[PDB]
Design a binder for this molecule. Sequence first.
Ligand SMILES: C[n+]1cn([C@@H]2O[C@H](COP(=O)(O)OP(=O)(O)OP(=O)(O)OC[C@H]3O[C@@H](n4cnc5c(=O)[nH]c(N)nc54)[C@H](O)[C@@H]3O)[C@@H](O)[C@H]2O)c2nc(N)[nH]c(=O)c21
Ligand SMILES: [Mn+2]
Length: 1256
Amino acid sequence: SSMILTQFGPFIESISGITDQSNDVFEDAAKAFSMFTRSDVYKALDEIPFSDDAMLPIPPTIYTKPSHDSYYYIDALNRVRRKTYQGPDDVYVPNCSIVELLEPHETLTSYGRLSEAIENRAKDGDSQARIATTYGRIAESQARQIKAPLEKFVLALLVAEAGGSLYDPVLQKYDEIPDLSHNCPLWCFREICRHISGPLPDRAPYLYLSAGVFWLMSPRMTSAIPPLLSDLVNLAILQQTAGLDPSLVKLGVQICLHAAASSSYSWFILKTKSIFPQNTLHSMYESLEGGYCPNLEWLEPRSDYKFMYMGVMPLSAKYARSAPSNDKKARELGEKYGLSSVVGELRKRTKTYVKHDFASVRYIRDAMACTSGIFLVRTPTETVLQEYTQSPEIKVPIPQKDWTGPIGEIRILKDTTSSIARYLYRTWYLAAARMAAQPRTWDPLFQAIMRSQYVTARGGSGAALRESLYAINVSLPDFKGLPVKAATKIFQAAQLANLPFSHTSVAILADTSMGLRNQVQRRPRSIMPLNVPQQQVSAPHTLTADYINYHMNLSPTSGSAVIEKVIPLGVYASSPPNQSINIDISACDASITWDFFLSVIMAAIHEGVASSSIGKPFMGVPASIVNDESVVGVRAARPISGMQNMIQHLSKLYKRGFSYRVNDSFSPGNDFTHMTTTFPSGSTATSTEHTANNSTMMETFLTVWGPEHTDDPDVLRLMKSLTIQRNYVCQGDDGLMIIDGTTAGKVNSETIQNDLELISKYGEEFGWKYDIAYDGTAEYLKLYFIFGCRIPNLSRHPIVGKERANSSAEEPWPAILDQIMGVFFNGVHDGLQWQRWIRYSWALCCAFSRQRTMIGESVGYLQYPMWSFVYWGLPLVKAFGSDPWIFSWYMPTGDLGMYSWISLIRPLMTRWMVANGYVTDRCSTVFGNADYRRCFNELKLYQGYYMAQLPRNPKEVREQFTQALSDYLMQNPELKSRVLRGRSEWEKYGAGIIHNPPSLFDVPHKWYQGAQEAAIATREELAEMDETLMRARRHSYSSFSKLLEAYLLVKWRMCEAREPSVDLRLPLCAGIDPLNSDPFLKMVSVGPMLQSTRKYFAQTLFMAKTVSGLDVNAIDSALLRLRTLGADKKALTAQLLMVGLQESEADALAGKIMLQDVNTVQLARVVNLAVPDTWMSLDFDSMFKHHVKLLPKDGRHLNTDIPPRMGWLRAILRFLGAGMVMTATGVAVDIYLEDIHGGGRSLGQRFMTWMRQEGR
Ligand SMILES: C[n+]1cn([C@@H]2O[C@H](COP(=O)(O)OP(=O)(O)OP(=O)(O)OC[C@H]3O[C@@H](n4cnc5c(=O)[nH]c(N)nc54)[C@H](O)[C@@H]3O)[C@@H](O)[C@H]2O)c2nc(N)[nH]c(=O)c21
Ligand SMILES: [Mn+2]
């Protein structure tokens, strides 16, 4: 596009596969991006000759909106509240005018901020002004839920799309993805915005600033415009990068337009977010006529979550959707929110898919990508008042007469009881007893670990803890003058370190400060962070819960990444013969209260733990005496253990309820403490606890309640065939009920429906509202599955979206780079069209790679070379004269990735350097006669490589602090004695061998550092970071890292492509089909990762956990390095003593390590090699084992042989080979070791040098 094509022409061709990429062009393009004014982006958009198919009616009511005033009021407690009109949910930001409340900005006369007068008038308690300030502040907060200005993302899209269709190297044809003239989201963006600016020279409807927003002073501007615009941009990019059906995309825009047309965008999106999934995913195959699905076997023990692929299951009518119909509800929702045309259009299209195949799952995926991806926002006041207000309705309470007299704070549940609580009790009692009986529980190291779990940089309600203690004349050290963020639990630990349990006890009842975090397609999550003393006392609860989840049930301990959400389980559960019910418990925290659960759980633990903990303190808490009115009449003083003493103090808090301090920053005058029985989300127990009750109640239902409430033979059979150990997987409030079918097909839908209704009624008995879904679909941990195929949900990963719950300003450049790289990796995992996605990312990165630096009137610029992004993981499109698109997005990160792409075109690079004057008489074992040193410096390859490795963020009372922390951790004398023994032992057997000895004595320093890096950076500090970056760019190098220089000595031969590991007609991941060549062939040739990645990697460490503050992978690395470096057994023993272990254990594990055959992944850590995040979804284990041959294609070579004592080389060598195979576009190929320049022996010594030199 002339304007665009004129300014980025050369760069546009370098990322389209037409021209080689070069830092000169990359950086020129970067300069061009930064010099582009916002209005120019809109002018560029004006040049696009949009097509009629990219247009649709834009509701005039989007622009003319009411005054915010009728949407708020002042309540009885003088809190600015949101006035409700559409219902209990209608509490978000309303769609109203905004210009009347702003004062023009000094320099940007066309933009304005909330009037200083209104705010000050609000600070002065005026009611009308408080309301206007609230609305103004919350509208802004809504507009800030993005990573950066939308104009950056649009400009990047224009620049990358000007490259036109992309030629697929494998399919050997150009893609047929429509050009921007057909992009309805973009057309809307341009039109809506143009209509708003009107005659104004400024085209941007609002400006996204570092801490706030300014709105274009147009009477046509609305508080709903930013969210609307943000959705459009995402949809614009996804249509070009995921190849989304343009027609499905228009439906999505329609929905957003309707949201802006309503009285509240966020609210409208919340009420209609189910449209696309319900009418596609949840209504597929009413008529199944064919296609294939996975046939997996769930290996034993089912708890390993390991699966094996056995082939494909031919689909027929026998498998058509049998679950309840949702047509009625689906159409009702549409009719009610003015979207029936969209519902019906979606229903009509869905019924046309009578075969389950790539085409159909892609259809679902596409549809599901259209849902708004905004991070919903509302004031903290509103979140508090809605999420902490109502308790659960216990329909069948525990009889009052079923409790004994008190034993301190608790009451025992009689065994006479008829309550079903009876079972909840036994289970926790049992677990507590076995937990407490474990010898490890009484190991000082174990207790240090439990005491360190909550010693972090995160807040722990510091202010309130200091006040509760102040009220009893217990003043904590201030550490006046220490450069650390005081509002951290690490700081809290330091303050409490030398105080007895008895002095801080009262803090257990102190207020809890509320936090907040916004979510996509969901209402705000509240964050109630307990303080150190509260977390300490919660240990018994947490431990018993872990014991249950570890020994008594089938449960996930997943994070937020797709790589750790046991994808394999979903495939299995959703694959016909099998069926899965998605069971969930809504309002979980508010349902785990004292009346039923907590009073029972506290008692069961307090009693089940009695004998094992008899006369000992625990984690710092002393034993004591409690009032005993247990047995009727008699009343004595009863001795209890430390562990019991904890439960004793915890019960008081649980029983009393929690006090949440709410400081609504967005609502002037909204400061208050709110009491509620709703469970804390920031307790070490929360998740594990909820997981334990989930499985316990489900178990009780399958064993007792259910069977006793029906005589239906079939329902009794179904129930009896299920077990929480084999058919029910849970985590927190989410659960998956997996019903293995049979040869005779799947279990009767009606029989399942009956047994689900029983579950529903059963929950009402103890206050749980089960959110059960039976729809032929599987849902668990936010991943969606149908017929064994994963459906990535693109709407949940907003490209421009970003969660900003507070008013603090965004992190300083270049933190945005990490976020952009994160956006890129989401695309890889979500399976976007690889070429279009790669090209786009390059444009996006380039658009953020340049930042203006100020140094006292000296205007300069920080510039990250294109090579820094390669290092971070972004694959090259074409360089050094190579063919285009030969590099896959599965190229590893850092050194391993650098090694991979370089090895792929090494000869080419050499040939290119000479052809361009980079020649020397000096011959290189890697680049021959190529003057690589002068080449890599001139094209900033070394600079980018080294710049990519710098931090992207600024960085007597000292002895006192570190010492306090030290006392906290080294509380128990036995632990210290262990570490010291290790130290004097390290001198004799380990010192000199390695210099990276991990040690408990390090924790205090690691913690101090953490409390420091948590504080806010100073202006000067930011400068030092920039200067560090500029220094690295100005310096000239002569080599890469020592490890990379060593890998480059290794050469390979790529041979025969691998045979398919799975059927080519089999849909595993929607979007990953024959139309997405690289990802598809990789999936097919390599094969999917069929085991939980947590369970897999948990097998690559000698020790699962350690003190919070040390790295388990680091300890595992130190041990393995000492072994490799020839150190003696006693040296590993010394290392293990320094990390808290007992001599007996130390000597044993150490002796075990000396003789163990370490697997590829675990041993590879000796040189810091890690399995790439992007590979986690594929069967990398198989690649290392059977597809990276270390015996040259034609036999043994002198240089390839592995020296007798260097068998550990094979591990490292496997990673290098796999690196090249995965980085090469197309099918995974068998790679064969061809050469090692100086031979294996010389190579091993080279790595040993690196090993012993670390931290020197
Ligand atoms: C000053 N500074 C800002 N950020 C970050 O910038 C953001 C908000 O800032 P802002 O309004 O203060 O920053 P400006 O980017 O500079 O806005 P701006 O008005 O954007 O840039 C000014 C003008 O420079 C012009 N320009 C850009 N590139 C070039 C170029 O290559 N050559 C020439 N001749 N002009 C250029 C262009 O006209 C443009 O309007 C913050 O959030 C920070 O994170 C910094 N980050 C680091 N590490 N170090 C810094 O010294 C620094
Ligand atoms: Mn669920």
